[PDB]
């Protein structure tokens, strides 16, 4: 029943605007886990479970998506302590986050960007089908299982229940945030998500994100700093349309010509990752 006897805690994996996350192994069966600790004092969004006991939204959102197998990180278990919640998450091994991966390798070949971006699209559709809006899609919140060639979306700490009405609150990453949030402090979930996917795709094919300053975010100009195919530039530009209603749906993204003939995850590992 207690947290300390049931998991062996190893080293810190990271910390920041997410918390303090340790590597661990579940003693029951030596399964690799990640043990995430969040201070109750630093949690602004709370939900309630089917159980009825009150939890941080992050927990609510992870249970809603941890249904079955996917490109979303699985919540295995959680615990309440006096001043915090501890979340036990899946840990792929070996793993690298997409931010370090792009730093190390630079601009990704399009074939590899295509397989990755496709898998991010499938994961975000999953969240949306489960009623969850992540709100912080970025390379930092994507893990790559280096052996399976599978991507996992992590860190739902800035997410919300998906709704069709307007959002007026946001605590995700500003350089992935859309221009309607910058200027008006309003967005709709899906269209904001697609903008952020546009940033992510540019990040993949160019080796860093397109915009750092507000004025660039609202300016509506995408300069390509790497050789990128016309079809890919068109997709990025569509995703980063200034008017939200001008952005593509997930379907339109996935039917885009640049998105056809995607590699399987195993093929991706074999060609690009071993």
């Amino acid at each position: 029943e207690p947290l300390e006897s049931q998991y062996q805690v190893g080293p810190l994996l990271g910390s920041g605007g997410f918390g303090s996350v340790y590597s661990g192994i579940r003693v029951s069966d030596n399964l690799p886990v990640a043990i995430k600790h969040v201070e109750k004092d630093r949690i602004s969004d709370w939900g309630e479970l089917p159980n009825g006991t009150r939890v941080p939204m992050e927990v609510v959102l992870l249970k809603k998506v941890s249904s079955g197998f996917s490109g979303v990180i699985r919540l295995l278990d959680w615990f309440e302590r006096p001043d915090s919640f501890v979340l036990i998450l899946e840990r792929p091994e070996p793993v690298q986050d997409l931010f370090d991966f792009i730093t190390e390798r630079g601009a990704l070949q399009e074939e590899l960007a295509r397989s990755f971006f496709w898998q991010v699209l499938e994961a975000v559709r999953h969240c949306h089908n489960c009623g969850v809006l992540h709100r912080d899609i970025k390379d930092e919140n994507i893990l790559i299982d280096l052996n399976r060639g599978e991507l996992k979306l992590i860190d739902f700490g800035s997410g919300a229940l998906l709704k069709d009405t307007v959002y007026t609150d946001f605590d995700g990453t500003r350089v992935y945030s859309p221009p309607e949030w910058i200027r008006y402090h309003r967005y709709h979930g899906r269209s904001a998500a697609v903008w952020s996917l546009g940033i992510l795709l540019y990040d993949m094919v160019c080796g860093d994100i397109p915009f750092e300053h507000d004025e660039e975010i609202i300016g509506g100009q995408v300069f390509f700093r790497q050789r990128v195919s016309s079809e890919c530039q068109h997709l990025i530009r569509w995703c980063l349309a200034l008017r939200p209603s001008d952005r593509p749906t997930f379907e339109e993204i996935q039917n885009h010509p640049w998105m056809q003939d995607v590699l399987l995850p195993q093929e991706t590992a074999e060609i690009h990752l071993h």
Binding site: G16, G17, F99, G172, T173, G207
Partner: peptide, 9 residues
Amino acid sequence: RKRRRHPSG
């Protein structure tokens, strides 16, 4: 040119 992480929170 400088590539960096960006905190959310």
